[PDB]
Structure 1
Amino acid sequence: MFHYHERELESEEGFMGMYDRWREQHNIEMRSPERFNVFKYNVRRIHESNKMDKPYKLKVNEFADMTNLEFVNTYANSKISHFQALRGSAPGSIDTDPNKDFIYANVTKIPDKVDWREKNAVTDVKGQGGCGSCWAFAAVVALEGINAIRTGKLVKFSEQQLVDCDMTNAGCDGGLMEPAFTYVIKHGGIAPEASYPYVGKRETCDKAKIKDVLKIDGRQNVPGLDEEALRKAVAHQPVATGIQLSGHGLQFYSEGVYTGDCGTEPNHGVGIVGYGENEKGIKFWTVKNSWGPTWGEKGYIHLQRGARKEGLCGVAMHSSFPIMNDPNPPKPNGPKDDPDAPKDPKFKTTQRLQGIRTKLLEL
């Protein structure tokens, strides 16, 4: 981290010294009155925020000399909300064939705290760069997670293969995570990162780098505007979802639970790797970002959980996960497996029930 004293803010000389010290500490070759002005703007705002009674803290990070408009347009431009409107359902929407429903809909015994990083199902924090590829990054957090859970082997997958090969999405201009998993099903799998390394710019789909693939059985969307449905999914595997990471407070987030203001128009894809509740009673989501370990809490953000119907920053708007069919399904114990329980509860698709009757009358 970068530290400073309150007085460096009182004078232009003290502030200029602090600018150049920050520049040296983060290896910024730029040294301009404009950039110095932006630094002053951002630092005063961090300073003012940290003075408040907030559950979260901000730090003078490597992005300190970028305006938030510059920041967002370089690091948070995957246009998730935009692409969801063009080729997708409104948050909350129900399935086409309401059975297949939501695989975790009926789970009962779930932990109060989950952290997939502790259950060896989370790779290191990655960096996306100027490329609006976060839909690929988020999809990969979910893909790495389920593979690690099902195989016991933690393997880093290719966001680059998704950027280059997934033509249903818009490469570095953005896209959606659900069509990314559909790509992984339809195109025979996702290669490891060692095989298809990340460049940070769209390139030609190289099928010669696509090997040692992870094949998935399916994909599903978590029912939207339901943070409990999201909690139920996260409890089983990391979930891919969009968020609005716009604003100074998110550009400089360092630690604690982010409870601050944010819009509900997702623009950046992230992977939810866990959840819990801190000592002060604040419920949160442990979110893995693609802005390197230099941002937030070693690359993570503990975002407030249970705050809005859509979730803080629209976390519970458009969430989804890849499916790898459970080889050993559990297990509760009670109630009895109902033979009269319908295969379709709306009795529209089928009249068939889950079992057959043994006790039979002549009529």
Structure 2
Amino acid sequence: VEIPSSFDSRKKWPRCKSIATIRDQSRCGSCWAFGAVEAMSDRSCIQSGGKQNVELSAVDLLSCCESCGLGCEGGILGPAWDYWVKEGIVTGSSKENHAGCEPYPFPKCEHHTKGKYPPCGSKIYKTPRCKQTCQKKYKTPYTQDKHRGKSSYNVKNDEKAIQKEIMKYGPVEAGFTVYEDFLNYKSGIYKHITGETLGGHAIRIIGWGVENKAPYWLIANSWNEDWGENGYFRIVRGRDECSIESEVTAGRIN
């Protein structure tokens, strides 16, 4: 199939509201779990033809996966997708929406940026306990509410492979290196110019494009809609910028 110069998963599958959803990790290094459950929500809607249109629970994955790392202190992308395949993940919304089996326990906050929510600040919440019980008003049994993948995999470190993967099966999760200057992103096509290495971040790549011939990936962040470009950012595409093409992970429901 031919690779178009631009592609946006929202435009290909507008019936799948999750693709346009911007989540908030709050004061927790749960990015690894957010990029996973977000892409899994998108893919479940895409690949099921809408029979599974759910918002999967970040807290179920964050709190219960034992092979996924350190919870709010950082996690591992491959095992997150394997957990979805082997154990499954229940439904759950933001704290503010208080919907689904296991809604997120932590409130929206601003991630080194201006807006109406309280600043996230420096403190990191303790990883929630693995409870495996739905909220009181949610009447579907926890075990019955589990949504499972069929397979998971790493995507090849190759721009065209990543493009084809997205177009065919939907958004992917990806890891990239956070340098200091990323925390001051407001708009544009990000690349590392200044600042030392801080750590890594895990996000959802939903498409790609070009601006004045400069290629980029279109990424949904998990720092709420006030951050960046309405919750999204763009980053240089095709030069493994901040290792953005090096840790791409996804999976399928069928």
Name the TM-score class by shorter chain. 0.7 to 0.9
Please say if residues 179 and 199 of structure 2, whose CA atoms lie closer than 8 Å, have aligned partners that are also in contact.
no
Please say if residues 155 and 162 of structure 2, whose CA atoms lie closer than 8 Å, have aligned partners that are also in contact.
yes
Bigger strand fraction? 2
Mapping of 1:218-233 within 5 angstroms?
Answer: 218-224=151-157, 226-233=158-165
- Partner residue in 2 for 1:184: 84
RMSD: 2.0
- Partner residue in 1 for 2:246: 317
Counterpart Cα distance in 2 of 1:302 and 1:288? 9
The residue matched to 2:152 in structure 1 has which SS? strand
Question: Does 1:208 find its partner at 2:133?
Answer: yes
Please say if residues 252 and 295 of structure 1, whose CA atoms lie closer than 8 Å, have aligned partners that are also in contact.
no
| TM-score normalized by the length of structure 1 | 0.55
- Partner residue in 2 for 1:246: 179
Q: How many residues align?
A: 211
Counterpart Cα distance in 1 of 2:39 and 2:199? 18
Mapping of 1:156-171 within 5 angstroms?
Answer: 156-169=55-68, 170-171=70-71
Counterpart Cα distance in 1 of 2:204 and 2:83? 18
The residue matched to 1:284 in structure 2 has which SS? strand
Following superposition, the deviation at residue 190 of structure 1 comes to 1.1
Counterpart Cα distance in 2 of 1:182 and 1:197? 22
The residue matched to 1:267 in structure 2 has which SS? strand
- Partner residue in 2 for 1:88: none
| TM-score normalized by the length of structure 2 | 0.77
Q: Tell which has more relative contact order, 1 or 2 (C-alpha 8 A, sep 6+).
A: 2
Please say if residues 86 and 148 of structure 2, whose CA atoms lie closer than 8 Å, have aligned partners that are also in contact.
no
- Partner residue in 2 for 1:137: 34
- Partner residue in 1 for 2:6: 113
Percent of aligned pairs sharing the same letter: 31
CA distance change for structure 1 residues 324 and 266 in 2, over 3 Å: closer, same or farther? farther
The residue matched to 1:178 in structure 2 has which SS? helix
Deviations 1:276-322 (A, max 9, x none): 112x101110011011111100000011111x2xx111111111102
Counterpart Cα distance in 2 of 1:318 and 1:115? 20
- Partner residue in 2 for 1:270: 203
Matched residue type, 1:156: E
Structure 2: any 5+ residue segments left out of the alignment? 93-99, 107-124, 135-141
Following superposition, the deviation at residue 268 of structure 1 comes to 0.6
- Partner residue in 1 for 2:120: none
CA distance change for structure 1 residues 247 and 274 in 2, over 3 Å: closer, same or farther? same
Counterpart Cα distance in 2 of 1:125 and 1:117? 12
Structure 1: any 5+ residue segments left out of the alignment? 1-107, 326-363
- Partner residue in 2 for 1:289: 221
